[PDB]
Amino acid sequence: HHVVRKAVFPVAGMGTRFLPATKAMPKEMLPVVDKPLIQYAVEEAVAAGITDLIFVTGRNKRAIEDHFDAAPELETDLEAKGKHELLALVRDILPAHVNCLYIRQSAPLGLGHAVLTAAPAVGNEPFAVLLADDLIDADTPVLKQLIDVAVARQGSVLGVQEVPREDTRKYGIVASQPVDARTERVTHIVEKPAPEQAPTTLAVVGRYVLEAAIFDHLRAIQLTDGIAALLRERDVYAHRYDGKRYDCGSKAGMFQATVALGRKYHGLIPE
Amino acid sequence: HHVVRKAVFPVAGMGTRFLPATKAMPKEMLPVVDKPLIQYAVEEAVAAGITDLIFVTGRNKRAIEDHFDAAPELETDLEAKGKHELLALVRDILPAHVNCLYIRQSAPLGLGHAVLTAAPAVGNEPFAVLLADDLIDADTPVLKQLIDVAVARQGSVLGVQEVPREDTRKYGIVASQPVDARTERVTHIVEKPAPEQAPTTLAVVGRYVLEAAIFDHLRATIQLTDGIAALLRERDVYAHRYDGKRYDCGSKAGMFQATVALGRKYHGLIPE
Ligand SMILES: [Cl-]
Ligand SMILES: [Cl-]
Ligand SMILES: [Cl-]
């Protein structure tokens, strides 16, 4: 039976669109108001039952490590000033039920190589993948929505979003047939199809629950290629999750996320 | 059938005996001539067929990571300064089939906590543990000697050696009975006994092949010796008198003698 307790977070984003701010920190450490992108994704994963966090690092790996590892000198300067809500902000980033490990990717070779880099830490277990640039604000954690489908259907699950047909050249797009109102069986995947040639308008977003059989298909490359090959052996579903995704891969999308989440969680309003 | 492919290296040694040098470097990064202690132990593990290296770090974890991760600017400065045979000493520390991952221990709480810290990376597999302060110079990698026993006899294996009775306060000491001329079946283990009350003079050194059932005994409630003792009650634990010379680099005296001896053997260095 399916138990998903490990999650892989590629956190070596170069973030060239955000240079020079990403000169000394990876893209996934840039904050939305007061919280790095990667912390939203970690909080989602932990809310969904993940206990083993696997960070795949690159340049400036220290920004990631220093964020999630304990910081005694900080907690010192904080509790000497009797700051309890603030200590909890730092110390309690992770519950004590949760552990992290770090693996350096050999070179920036894309998401399929980042996932394969995590194999020694995953073993022969299904596992999650979360791309922190896809900042999802949802009433129920999206990874949990995906895990629940993966356990019930017994297969890998890709998170998908309905997108305008005119925009399909921006995304990986599934070819799939409905099996219920939100979940589909995937038969093919196509990267950046022309709008009139796209098989659906269901775009892959950066939330995956993958069976460990994927690793052998990544050793045979791109993650979409490894999933395409996985389908020929095992079951792969897509699930149109309930939630609002902010694409923080662009400055525009990162800016709208700051506005929207600044408003909703911080009562910040533009002049 | 036993497959040992993962090895845990606790590398958060405070090395208070070596302060101030270990202020900004963990103890396991101190070099013996031209090589950090931890690289000798990694090279033994790799020669023994280990492919997944698991470093349990603490303070100054950066020195460990930067030593084993790639360093492109150094291959640059090497190519500009003229060297090229030096590239192999740097790029080729690890073979291409070997990977490293880093877990931070939650606090310096002893070897048993350090082993348990590696549990998420090891899973339900037998695994090796190597303490880099125990620098071992052997014709055959000691970890290989122990893994071969572990596979043949289907149990955990502690690396052991005879020590003077007077020194038993420094070691975990096994009570055991012989199974062949080098391997013993462990019946008990005692942490730092008084010389006159030590059950034997067979000391555990820092090489171990442990079955994954040890993790649950390290969670049951903290010392590695207690985990092994509990493991004995349910599973087989052997001790193996390995072939090789062990230098106790945990003291300044033992690190000094490793530098003199390996200086002589491998670098042609002789006190004047
Ligand atoms: Cl640094
Ligand atoms: Cl310690
Ligand atoms: Cl634990």
CB contact under 8 A, A104 and B65: yes
How many angstroms is it from B99 CA to the middle of ligand 1?
Answer: 21
Q: What does the alpha-carbon distance between residue B168 and residue B162 come to, in Å, rounded to a whole number?
A: 10
DSSP lists the bridge partners of residue B127 as B210
How many angstroms is it from A93 CA to the middle of ligand 3?
Answer: 18
Cβ atoms of B59 and B106 within 8 Å: the answer is no
What is the DSSP-derived secondary structure letter of residue B166? G
Mutate to test the interface with B, among A99, A109, A117, A215 (most CBs of B within 10 A): A99
Mutate to test the interface with B, among A102, A122, A125, A219 (most CBs of B within 10 A): A102
Q: What is the largest CA-CA distance in chain A?
A: 63
Q: Which CATH superfamily is domain B6-267 in?
A: Spore Coat Polysaccharide Biosynthesis Protein SpsA; Chain A (3.90.550.10)
CB contact under 8 A, B104 and A65: yes
Neighbours of A123 (CB within 10 A): 17
Q: What does the alpha-carbon distance between residue B231 and residue B234 come to, in Å, rounded to a whole number?
A: 6
How far is Cα of residue A40 from the mean position of the Cα atoms in its chain? 9
Which method was used?
A: X-ray
- Closest-CA distance, A173 to chain B, in angstroms, reads 33
CB contact under 8 A, B101 and A103: yes
Name the residue among A52, A104, A123 with its Cβ closest to that of B69: A104
**Minimal-distance CA residue of chain A relative to B96:** A106
DSSP lists the bridge partners of residue A237 as A157, A185
Nearest-5° Cα angle at A245, A227 to A53: 60
- How far is the CA of A46 from the CAs of A192, A243, B28, B108, in angstroms? 31, 17, 34, 26
Task: State the amino acid at position B206 in one-letter form.
Answer: G
- Nearest Cα neighbor of B172 from B229, B134, B131, B218 is B229
Q: What does the alpha-carbon distance between residue A142 and residue A207 come to, in Å, rounded to a whole number?
A: 8
Cβ atoms of B57 and B51 within 8 Å: the answer is no
Closest ligand to C-alpha of residue B112 is: 2
Cβ atoms of B171 and B158 within 8 Å: the answer is no
Cβ atoms of B142 and B242 within 8 Å: the answer is yes
Neighbours of A254 (CB within 10 A): 22
Chain A residues in contact with B103 (beta carbon < 8 A):
99-102
Closest ligand to C-alpha of residue A65 is: 1
How far is Cα of residue B183 from the mean position of the Cα atoms in its chain? 19
How many angstroms is it from B68 CA to the middle of ligand 1?
Answer: 14
What is the bridge-based pairing of β-strands B6-10 and B127-130? parallel
CB contact under 8 A, A106 and B65: no
**Domain A6-266 = CATH 3.90.550.10:** yes
What is the bridge-based pairing of β-strands A156-162 and A202-210? antiparallel
DSSP lists the bridge partners of residue A127 as A210
By residue count, chain B amounts to 272
Ranges of each domain in chain B: 6-267
CB contact under 8 A, B61 and A61: no
Torsion, CA A41, CA A42, CA A47, CA A52, rounded to 10: 140
Instruction: Spell out which chain A residues touch chain B, with contact meaning CB-CB distance below 8 angstroms.
Output: 6, 51-52, 61-62, 65, 69-70, 99-104, 106, 117, 120-121, 123, 125
Tokens matching residue B68: 């084993």
Q: What does the alpha-carbon distance between residue B255 and residue B249 come to, in Å, rounded to a whole number?
A: 4
- Nearest Cα neighbor of B22 from B111, B157, B170, B133 is B133
Chain A residues in contact with B106 (beta carbon < 8 A):
70
Residue with tokens 């013993």: B184
Percentages helix, strand, coil for chain B (3-state, rounded to 5) are 40, 25, 35
Tokens matching residue B71: 């360093």
Q: What is the residue-wise DSSP string for B9-26?
A: EE-----GGGTTGGGSS-
What is the DSSP-derived secondary structure letter of residue B102? E
Q: What does the alpha-carbon distance between residue A138 and residue A48 come to, in Å, rounded to a whole number?
A: 12
Nearest-5° Cα angle at B258, B255 to B261: 150
CB contact under 8 A, B100 and A103: yes
Backbone phi and psi for residue A218, each to the nearest 5 degrees, phi listed first? -80, -20
Q: What is the largest CA-CA distance in chain B?
A: 62
3-state secondary structure A3-66: CCCEEEEECCCCCHHHCCCCCCCCHHHCEECCEEHHHHHHHHHHHCCCCEEEEEEECEHHHHHH
CB contact under 8 A, B65 and A121: no
SS3 B161: strand
Listed in sequence order, the residues at least 6 apart from A222 whose beta carbon sits closer than 8 Å to its beta carbon are A110, A111, A112, A191
Name the residue among A61, A101, A106 with its Cβ closest to that of B101: A101
